[PDB]
Amino acid sequence: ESWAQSRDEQNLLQQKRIWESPLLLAAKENNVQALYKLLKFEGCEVHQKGAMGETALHIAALYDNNEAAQVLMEAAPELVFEPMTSELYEGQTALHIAVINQNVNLVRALLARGASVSARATGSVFHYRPHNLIYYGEHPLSFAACVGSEEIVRLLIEHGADIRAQDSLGNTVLHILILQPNKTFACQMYNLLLSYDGGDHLKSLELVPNNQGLTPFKLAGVEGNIVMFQHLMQKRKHIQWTYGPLTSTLYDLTEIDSSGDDQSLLELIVTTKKREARQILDQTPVKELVSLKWKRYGRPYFCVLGAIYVLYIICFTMCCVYRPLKPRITNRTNPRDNTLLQQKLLQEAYVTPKDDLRLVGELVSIVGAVIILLVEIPDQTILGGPFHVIIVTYAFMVLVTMVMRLTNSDGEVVPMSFALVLGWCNVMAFARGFQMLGPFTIMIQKMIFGDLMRFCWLMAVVILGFASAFYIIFQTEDPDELGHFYDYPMALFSTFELFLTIIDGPANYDVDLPFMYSITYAAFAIIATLLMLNLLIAMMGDTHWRVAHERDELWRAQVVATTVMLERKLPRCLWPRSGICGREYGLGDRWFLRVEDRQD
Amino acid sequence: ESWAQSRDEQNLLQQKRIWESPLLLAAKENNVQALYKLLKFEGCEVHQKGAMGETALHIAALYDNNEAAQVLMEAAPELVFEPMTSELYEGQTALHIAVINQNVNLVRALLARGASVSARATGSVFHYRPHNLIYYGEHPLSFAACVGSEEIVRLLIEHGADIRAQDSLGNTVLHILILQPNKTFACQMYNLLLSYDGGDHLKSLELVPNNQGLTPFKLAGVEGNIVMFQHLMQKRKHIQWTYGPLTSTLYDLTEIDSSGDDQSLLELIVTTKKREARQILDQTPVKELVSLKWKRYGRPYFCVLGAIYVLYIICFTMCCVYRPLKPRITNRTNPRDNTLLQQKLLQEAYVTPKDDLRLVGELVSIVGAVIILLVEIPDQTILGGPFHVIIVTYAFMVLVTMVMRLTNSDGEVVPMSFALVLGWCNVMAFARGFQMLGPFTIMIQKMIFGDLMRFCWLMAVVILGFASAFYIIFQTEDPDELGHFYDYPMALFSTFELFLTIIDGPANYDVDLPFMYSITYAAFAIIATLLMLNLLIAMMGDTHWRVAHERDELWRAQVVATTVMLERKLPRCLWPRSGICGREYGLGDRWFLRVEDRQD
Ligand SMILES: NCCOB(c1ccccc1)c1ccc(Br)cc1
Ligand SMILES: NCCOB(c1ccccc1)c1ccc(Br)cc1
Ligand SMILES: CC1NC(=O)NC1CCCCCC(=O)O
Ligand SMILES: CC1NC(=O)NC1CCCCCC(=O)O
């Protein structure tokens, strides 16, 4: 409490030691006449450590003081090898600070003194974290690549800088360039670093994987870096011919398609929470891949599953609507005359005239629940499919209904009634794709699990304020004639119904309503309308020109997400691999997709 | 009746004396040959006063007539010291008019004659009022600073102009520059006036406070002058280091943070009615201040108070829903058989089986009401918190319910029922902040106390037009079967319900409705819908792209308003002062907030 306070304090605690130490003060202010007055006559603490474990050279490198830095290296040339010792800066040398500041005349003078070109900077402030406004890696070659100083990147390779060197997160200098803001300038820097590769077709830096199993080409897709994704595609696409305006290009489709297994660029985009990566399946090598994946194979099998699931649910309801006998067969209708229960229990089973059709019906319904369960027990909380967490709980309710059966509980209706709504309402998950009702279900997915829960807690109040009042108002009145609030639980249910203007509202003209109801309900009506108009106006805002493109981009996104998931579960005798393979014609040996386009 | 007419008349009355007086006429028209024909042979009234107490030189200065002004000062050099004598222009000299017109060759010639550089212009038209299209102050140095003529500002200081001089409103020349339209040019003029300061660290013009206790840096925040607020920040922020793109700057945070007490820039912004100052807490020294004020300390304590207030209200309703016995215990059900009252009165108290839980419940509810009262009797009508004027009236209803108790009035329900709605609906004031339901409650705050009262008086009509009709229509009919309007008060209540389409509307098919109801209700339905559609379309307009930013700016504004108010009421053992202090490291001695940023 807190980490931000510590660095805020230690930045202030550093300036304290700078101001206190006359050596570090002159190194900060570039006082050449004061450094020699401290190092030569008399001899002071030349290896003086500051608050952050810094040296006088580390301070002289933070503020571009070349004159004050040459003084410290001509009087004591061992300060160059010294790294920062504090935890915030563990591993940083004076070369890192000069590279970050793009001090060319200092880096070219630091490498003449013999500085290390492989000094990791494992400090807590050099880590890949949101609280760090940057992430340039750990090696000084990566720092030169991130600042964009091409004069320093090649000047480091001149003195044995290794481009293959990875950091603590297994990232090469190519992986770090992908996570940078200046995308258009990093492409030129990405090519500058590729030229120093070994040059052989095997063991290439573009193939050196991240420690999370992610080549630089594959990392660009997950990160949503379109400028780098398009640039990394030039290395892996072959133009077949140029027939005037037409140009049929052949795409590599190696690391773009599965499998794999999870080492597939498509599976990484459909499973990530990055809102930027959703634009990658709209790129011209991939958009042709998934569009052909859905026109054939994709759309039919999804409709078959829906046609199967439509007939599967309509069979389950056929068992419910034809639920077993019988009437209440009990004098239970005498206690609490408000009871109209004719509870149907078992058994009373089977001895089947037309009842054996319901036996095979209950059998078909229960074998589908375990089939769903068997295919949905995966060894969670994701966008691309928020409806089929309900399909695994539907199979849970069927089993409970099966356990509610064979026990014959008076609560036989509650579990058998829950599966009716979850089963059907899950069929509009098949509206996804299909047609233009797909993005409409995207609207319902975005509201049910976001704008609802927040606005409910707003609408959860007010009601119980007026419901508690209406209870007190009509706790005094006789609930026989006009008793919308006879007890407290129904007082809230009747008030909730009245918030949505369903019931006519308590209206009785034979009797006289209490003096407080006619006053309390008028206010509840005006607030319930204003609270509902503001709910409709709050819908606006997610109606601009971009949100119609957003949900349409989200629709086709979750359609591609459904397409990739079907291919990774269905067998291989159906659904062939998209593209053509290169085996005599031996121009592979991988699978290629041929796409021609016309430049206007 | 009116003040605008007076100056309109006295401007016309002035031109009368100009046209009538041949001296003032020639001074207006720059008739050099006519001034000498009036002053030298013969000698006329050279000190002639006009309608506005002006002189011939005052008229010759209004219209840039240097040739006609030198005539009046070479023949009578005492007219320079003469000020305007009218009430509209009390205190204005011929130097003020030359400075306003930026007459450099006249001001440099007026100071050779020996004009006063400290002549206040206390006229009614020089005051800081909305009816005055400008406000340049009272001293001629301030006039030079407002017109932007740098050649005149320094030319006045050359002749002993005091920059420390304040006006009637305690404003320095620096305070007046903040209240100017040309913000981008006043910054250069603000620096020109700082250079003539004493130069010592103590008794500085930037510290000279307004007569309302407001330094020029603090006045810029309340006024919403962002260009000056950013410019005045350069004098009070220290850059710690520059590490390539990163640059951790240290902000002064002296006059920005409390306390104080009310001498705090944050407390001035959250309490002002200026729509412009709301943009100040979005500035880079302040936005980091309040964001860290709400991430920790702010948001938890506000949720604790809400969690306390949620449990406090749910306890109060537990006492209401379990209100005391008993039935009506009276033959009062015989008079007016429309009565279903079973009025519950006391006492009938206590002798507690499970009733002692309601005794401590009523005790917890009453001690919270006075606690609210004790902390809300402040020795009003503001935006940043329109819901908790209801929390002080809630505590008023609890006490009245306590006074309604111990008296056992038949109106026991009315005060006990009012506290149920005000207590709960005040909990959605805690929706402010929290999440995205905060700006939604901003919508409800902006509608309940603005668009409602105006539109109600529109919807207040029509209803009583049709309600009075429907009463007359069914004053003839028998209210037993279909009696929505049996008496006049319920005739308005039933018509109001029908305006919101709650009741089914009077529909009886066993009997025949009067020939006028079927005609009158059809018109009422069409108008009630058009009058409601136009109410929904009137919501649009406050739905553009800017109003979603407005209410979102208003949301975070009232969140900062809630954050500052909590800090100024909660003790000091919790909630530490935001930032770090400068006491060894002795670089203060005030509190500083360290903020680093990255320039792309
Ligand atoms: N059954 C689990 C979720 O359902 B689905 C789903 C899978 C196949 C066919 C239809 C729907 C899903 C949605 C998004 C992603 Br990404 C992955 C799967
Ligand atoms: N209780 C009086 C008003 O309530 B509030 C309020 C104060 C503390 C916690 C929650 C709400 C308020 C709102 C805006 C301003 Br600005 C100042 C106070
Ligand atoms: C203490 C330090 N001394 C120095 O020469 N640089 C310091 C820190 C530099 C800022 C790096 C912060 C970041 O990258 O997040
Ligand atoms: C009567 C006057 N004679 C004159 O030379 N100026 C007059 C008035 C000037 C206008 C100032 C109005 C204002 O500042 O609001």
Give the whole-angstrom CA distance, residue A461 versus residue A523: 15
- A79 and A192 fall within a common domain: yes
Give the whole-angstrom CA distance, residue A96 versus residue B375: 57
B592 φ, ψ (degrees, to nearest 5): -125, 145
Facing residue for A147 by CB, picked from B244, B503, B580: B244
DSSP code at position A84:
P
Distance from CA of A287 to the nearest CA of B (A): 32
Distance from CA of B593 to the nearest CA of A (A): 8
Distance from CA of B191 to the nearest CA of A (A): 27
Q: Is the CB of B138 under 6 A from ligand 4?
A: no
Exposure string of A186-214, with b = 16+ CB inside 10 Å and e = fewer, is bbebbeebeebeeeeeeeebeebbbeeeb
Nearest bound ligand to the CA of residue A432: 1
Exposure string of A546-577, with b = 16+ CB inside 10 Å and e = fewer, is eeeebbebbbbbbbbbbbbebbeeeeeeeeee
Residues of A in contact with B341 (CB under 8 A): 476-477, 514
Give the whole-angstrom CA distance, residue A96 versus residue A110: 11
3-state secondary structure of A199: coil
Helix H or strand E encompassing A246: strand A246-251
Contact B95, B116 (CB under 8 A): yes
CA-closest residue to ligand 2 atom 11: B562
Q: Is A281 left (phi over 0), alpha (psi -120 to 50) or beta?
A: alpha
Give the whole-angstrom CA distance, residue B388 versus residue B432: 12
Contact B239, B286 (CB under 8 A): no
Rounded to the nearest angstrom, the distance between the alpha carbon of B51 and the centre of ligand 4 is 12
Burial class (CB in 10 A: 0-12, 13-18, 19+), B69: buried
Q: Is the CB of A562 under 6 A from ligand 1?
A: yes
Contact B186, B228 (CB under 8 A): yes
- B509 and B597 fall within a common domain: no
State which approach was used to obtain the coordinates. Answer: X-ray
Contact A131, A3 (CB under 8 A): yes
Contact B249, B596 (CB under 8 A): yes
Give the whole-angstrom CA distance, residue B579 versus residue B556: 21
What is the amino acid identity at position A370? V
Q: Which residues contact A525 (CB under 8 A, 6 or more apart)?
A: A505, B496, B497, B500, B502
Query: Annotation-wise, does B504 bind a ligand?
Result: yes
H-assigned helices in B195-264: 216-223, 226-233
Q: Compute CA B582 distance to the chain's CA centroid, rounded to the nearest angstrom.
A: 36
Asked, as a colleague might, if the bond just before B355 is cis with ω within 30 of 0, I would say: no
Sign, CA torsion B485/B487/B492/B493? negative
Q: Which residues contact B126 (CB under 8 A, 6 or more apart)?
A: B89, B91, B92, B132, B135, B136, B137, B138
3-state secondary structure of A427: helix
Q: Which domain holds residue B502?
A: 284-577
- A211 and A322 fall within a common domain: no
Give the whole-angstrom CA distance, residue A389 versus residue A428: 14
- A242 and A132 fall within a common domain: yes
- B381 and B270 fall within a common domain: no
Distance from CA of A531 to the nearest CA of B (A): 7
Contact A297, A574 (CB under 8 A): yes
Give the whole-angstrom CA distance, residue B393 versus residue B373: 9
DSSP code at position A529:
H
Residues of A in contact with B319 (CB under 8 A): none
3-state DSSP of B114-156: CCCCCCCCCCHHHCCCCCCCCCCCCCHHHHHHHHCCHHHHHHH
Give the whole-angstrom CA distance, residue A513 versus residue B36: 95
Of the candidates A74, A53, A64, A52, the residue with the CA atom closest to the CA atom of residue A27: A64
Say yes or no for a CB contact (<8 Å) between B416 and A534.
no
Candidates B404, B437, B459, B540, partner chain A, best to mutate (most A CBs within 10 A): B437
Of the candidates A224, A218, A208, the residue with the CA atom closest to the CA atom of residue A172: A208
Beta strands in B526-579 (DSSP E): none
Number of domains in chain A: 2
Q: Is the CB of A346 under 6 A from ligand 1?
A: no
- B416 and B399 fall within a common domain: yes
- CB atoms under 10 Å from CB of B94, counted, come to 30
Facing residue for A501 by CB, picked from B338, B448, B502: B502
Of the candidates A390, A378, A238, A258, the residue with the CA atom closest to the CA atom of residue A313: A390
- A122 and A140 fall within a common domain: yes
Strand partners of residue A580: A592
What is the amino acid identity at position A548? A
Q: B537 to chain A: nearest residue by CA?
A: A537
Residue among B262, B562, B570 to mutate when testing ligand 2 (max atoms within 8 A of CB): B562
Helix H or strand E encompassing B592: strand B591-598
- CB atoms under 10 Å from CB of A321, counted, come to 8
Which residue carries 């260009």 as its tokens?
B227
Question: CA gyration radius for chain B?
Answer: 36
Beta strands in B162-225 (DSSP E): none
- B361 and B376 fall within a common domain: yes
- A241 and A344 fall within a common domain: no
Candidates A455, A471, A476, partner chain B, best to mutate (most B CBs within 10 A): A476
Helix B22-29 and helix B3-20: axis angle, to 10°? 100
Nearest bound ligand to the CA of residue A304: 1
Burial class (CB in 10 A: 0-12, 13-18, 19+), A158: exposed
Q: Is the CB of A385 under 6 A from ligand 1?
A: yes
Exposure string of B207-225, with b = 16+ CB inside 10 Å and e = fewer, is ebbbeeebbbbbbbbbbbb
Give the whole-angstrom CA distance, residue A434 versus residue B559: 45
Say yes or no for a CB contact (<8 Å) between B421 and A523.
yes
Q: Resolution, in Å, please?
A: 3.6
Q: Strands B591-598, A237-243: parallel, antiparallel or unpaired by DSSP?
A: unpaired
Rounded to the nearest angstrom, the distance between the alpha carbon of B595 and the centre of ligand 3 is 13
Say yes or no for a CB contact (<8 Å) between A462 and B425.
yes
Q: A473 to chain B: nearest residue by CA?
A: B413
3-state secondary structure of B571: coil
What is the amino acid identity at position A97? I
Contact A171, A136 (CB under 8 A): no
- A308 and A262 fall within a common domain: no
Give the whole-angstrom CA distance, residue B531 versus residue A553: 38
Give the whole-angstrom CA distance, residue A430 versus residue A385: 11
Rounded to the nearest angstrom, the distance between the alpha carbon of A529 and the centre of ligand 2 is 26
Nearest bound ligand to the CA of residue B557: 2
Q: B295 to chain A: nearest residue by CA?
A: A2
Say yes or no for a CB contact (<8 Å) between B342 and A476.
yes
Return the structure tokens found at B7.
Answer: 């100056």
- B348 and B317 fall within a common domain: yes
Atom of ligand 1 nearest to the CA of A376: 1
Q: Is the CB of A132 under 6 A from ligand 3?
A: yes
Distance from CA of B435 to the nearest CA of A (A): 8
CA-closest residue to ligand 3 atom 9: B243
3-state secondary structure of A237: strand
Q: In Å, how far are B185, B293, B367, B442 from B550, measured between CA atoms? A: 28, 22, 39, 10
Determine the length of chain A: 600
3-state secondary structure of A550: helix
Nearest bound ligand to the CA of residue A430: 1
Angle at B337 between CA B336 and CA B341, to 5 degrees: 90
Asked, as a colleague might, if the bond just before B585 is cis with ω within 30 of 0, I would say: yes
Question: CA gyration radius for chain A?
Answer: 36
- B88 and B120 fall within a common domain: yes
Facing residue for B594 by CB, picked from A12, A468, A476: A12
